[PDB]
Amino acid sequence: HAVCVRHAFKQYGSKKNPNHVLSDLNMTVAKGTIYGLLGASGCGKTTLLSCIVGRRRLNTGEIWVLGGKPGTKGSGVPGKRVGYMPQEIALYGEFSIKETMMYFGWIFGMESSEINERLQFLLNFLDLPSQNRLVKNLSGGQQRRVSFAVALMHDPELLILDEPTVGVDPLLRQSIWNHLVQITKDGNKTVIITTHYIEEARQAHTIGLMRSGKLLAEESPHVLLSMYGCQSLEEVFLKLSSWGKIKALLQKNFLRMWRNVGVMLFIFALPVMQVILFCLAIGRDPTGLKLAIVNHEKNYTNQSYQECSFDYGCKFSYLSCRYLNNLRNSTILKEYYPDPESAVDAVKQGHAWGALYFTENFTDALVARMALGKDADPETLDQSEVRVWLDMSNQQIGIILQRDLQLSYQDFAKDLLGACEQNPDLAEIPISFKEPIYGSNKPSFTDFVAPGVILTIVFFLAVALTSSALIIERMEGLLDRSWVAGVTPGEILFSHVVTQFVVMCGQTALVLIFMILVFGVQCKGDIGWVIVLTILQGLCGMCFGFVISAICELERNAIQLALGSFYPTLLLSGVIWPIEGMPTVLRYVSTFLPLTLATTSLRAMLTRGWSIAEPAVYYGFLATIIWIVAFLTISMLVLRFK
């Protein structure tokens, strides 16, 4: 009437050593009775119950329950017509008892006014603590009783229970059995219960004894004892032979993140700290650089004083303190030494980045050098020069020092003339740099790396959240419990995409506000298309999190896969160094990576202000869309023939 199983096979393990849990099996459960399923091992009964509710799909079998096959649109197994208690405690923490009751009632479509009566009745009957207590703050027995109350709340016509009374007090166990007997009799309710107390299953109506994947007997307990003349059942076994369902899922997802402070800090406060620290340390020009100066045109007094005095008008008095007046104060500090040997010794230590030497004949030789032109003898060309020894072990510092020293002389050369009706253009190399077409004369390395930092934060934090949430929830039977309740797989997936979309929108707003408004990173292009590209890259990472969760079953295995691809793609996507420095063969391969073309597209919009119509901009838009499709296809193809 209620359940009928015929020829049900199932096995686990490899082909060489298979663990046969189920073999040729026959079961018939009458409507309106308590059945009772006793077996030597707890795995076969669990597999049978999971196949009955329709969540395991055993091979080469036949299950008929409440109209037809589970989940076939001819029966009512997935929905409010059955009440399922799993073997594990498939309950959400950080939720009170009343909140759990309300959530599961909203899933089953009960009115909020008729849920309170059931909640109070179950609280009184099952000896439970206050309804405001969090589930994670309860003990194992209390949590199991709360799960039982959840299974009993909606009054189903079929109850499938997996060890409801395992560590319950004998008085409470007796009361529970009396309640089950009462609701079963004089009604249309059927109970299928598996227990370890064989004697306790004496009020049951049709005991089915399970052994070696088959049923040794299935018949009334009293009559079974009558046939063999036994006073206990123990020695008989000794045989030597749908929108409202989306609000509930959406509300639950937002409350789980809000009540986890550590989760809120990792996905919202961690990105802000990286942006703040990156904009304060990476890309700025060094400023604290010390140079050793040996000016032999002036008396030496101290390592911090030189008395650099000269007449600013004309007559070219010193021309060596005049040159040092044009040195940029922001990046270079000046220290003074008495000998070139002692100044060089400072550079050989960590006391200076370079040494400058002026001979006592510098002024006269320099004045004569410009007055002779191409007729200057080698003597005046020797004494009219500044000897510079530099520490070039640091690439960025050496570039700054050389550029500042050279640009300081250009200002010095253009300052000597100009008041004498001489155009400063006489002191220019024929190679003349006009106004830059893009950018300025002082480009910043922070502006080059900033586009890649934004995309990597949004992409890789969507992989971690999606992979962990789906793996954890699937591994403790939380998805399976909701599927039996009548929640379709398309509704669960829809609610996950919406929740992740809102999360990544908050991250995008926070990252862009600090980078642009606070730290002054330039954005020459349209900010509308900058947001769209950032959101699309976040959705690309979410689809990659579907792939990881579809192939991994432990959380420790998922993080290794994520970190195993987070490192190689960072070094090949041109985030910290220009892509033009790579070898040609490696450069071509890198263009097919998920983030390479999008980082280039974002950089052009921020640094050059290019529009969406430029090929270099929309090429990164299309590469993100293709990777989204590829990631979704890979995740589906895992289950296509499996």
Ligand X SMILES: CCCCCCCCCCC(CCCCCCCCCC)(CO[C@@H]1O[C@H](CO)[C@@H](O[C@H]2O[C@H](CO)[C@@H](O)[C@H](O)[C@H]2O)[C@H](O)[C@H]1O)CO[C@@H]1O[C@H](CO)[C@@H](O[C@H]2O[C@H](CO)[C@@H](O)[C@H](O)[C@H]2O)[C@H](O)[C@H]1O
Ligand Y SMILES: CC/C=C\C/C=C\C/C=C/C/C=C/C/C=C\CCCCOC[C@H](COP(=O)(O)OCCN)OC(=O)CCCCCCCCCCCCCCCCC
Ligand Z SMILES: CCCCCCCC/C=C\CCCCCCCC(=O)N[C@@H](CO)[C@H](O)CCCCCCCCCCCCCCC
Please identify which residue in the block is written with the tokens 């107390």: 197
How many Å apart are CA 444 and CA 399, to the nearest integer? Answer: 14
Phi then psi for 218, rounded to 5 degrees?
Answer: -150, 95
Selected binder of a second copy within 59, 72, 120, 139 (CB under 8 A)? 139
585-604 binders of a second copy (CB under 8 A)? 586, 590
Instruction: Decide which of ligand Z, a second copy, ligand Y, none touches 456; Cβ closer than 5 to 8 Å per partner kind.
Output: ligand Z
Selected binder of ligand Y within 270, 280, 475, 513 (CB under 6 A)? 270
Binding letters toward ligand Z, positions 561-580, x by CB under 6 A: -xx--xx--x-----x----
Task: Give the DSSP letter of residue 284.
Answer: P
Please identify which residue in the block is written with the tokens 């409470």: 172
351 is in an annotated binding site: no
Instruction: Decide which of ligand Z, a second copy, ligand X, none touches 406; Cβ closer than 5 to 8 Å per partner kind.
Output: a second copy
Tokens of 355: 């040494």
Selected binder of ligand Z within 28, 203, 274, 383 (CB under 6 A)? 274
How many Å apart are CA 238 and CA 487, to the nearest integer? Answer: 43
Selected binder of ligand X within 367, 368, 390, 559 (CB under 6 A)? 559
Is residue 458 within 8 Å of 210, Cβ to Cβ?
A: no
Is residue 489 within 8 Å of 483, Cβ to Cβ?
A: yes
Q: Which stretch binds ligand X (CB under 6 A): 89-97, 122-130, 375-383, 574-582?
A: 89-97
To the nearest 10 degrees (0 to 180), the angle between helices 478-485 and 489-512 is: 130
Q: Which amino acid is at 447?
A: D
How many Å apart are CA 80 and CA 77, to the nearest integer? Answer: 8
Kindly state the smallest distance separating residue 146's Cβ from ligand X, in Å: 9
Instruction: Decide which of ligand Z, ligand Y, a second copy, none touches 348; Cβ closer than 5 to 8 Å per partner kind.
Output: a second copy
459-518 binders of ligand X (CB under 6 A)? 464-465, 468-469, 472, 476, 496, 499-500, 503
Task: Give the DSSP letter of residue 27.
Answer: E
Selected binder of ligand Y within 40, 265, 372, 381 (CB under 6 A)? 265
Is residue 174 within 8 Å of 200, Cβ to Cβ?
A: no
77-116 binders of ligand Z (CB under 6 A)? none
Selected binder of ligand Y within 152, 511, 552, 617 (CB under 6 A)? 552
Selected binder of a second copy within 216, 559, 612, 630 (CB under 8 A)? 559
Please identify which residue in the block is written with the tokens 């950080």: 94
Is residue 162 within 8 Å of 87, Cβ to Cβ?
A: yes
From 177, 230, 237, 165, select the one nearest 208 (Cα to Cα). Answer: 237
623-642 binders of ligand Y (CB under 6 A)? 634
443-472 binders of ligand Z (CB under 6 A)? 453, 456-457, 460-461, 463-464
How many Å apart are CA 259 and CA 136, to the nearest integer? Answer: 12
Selected binder of a second copy within 283, 364, 367, 591 (CB under 8 A)? 283
DSSP H or E segment with residue 83: strand 82-85
How many Å apart are CA 78 and CA 597, to the nearest integer? Answer: 46
Binding residues (CB under 6 A) for ligand Y: these are 262, 265-266, 269-270, 273, 544, 547, 551-554, 557, 560-561, 564-565, 569, 594, 634
Q: Which residues make up each annotated binding site?
A: 12, 41-42, 45-47, 133, 141, 162, 196
Q: Which residues make up each annotated binding site for Mg(2+)?
A: 46, 162
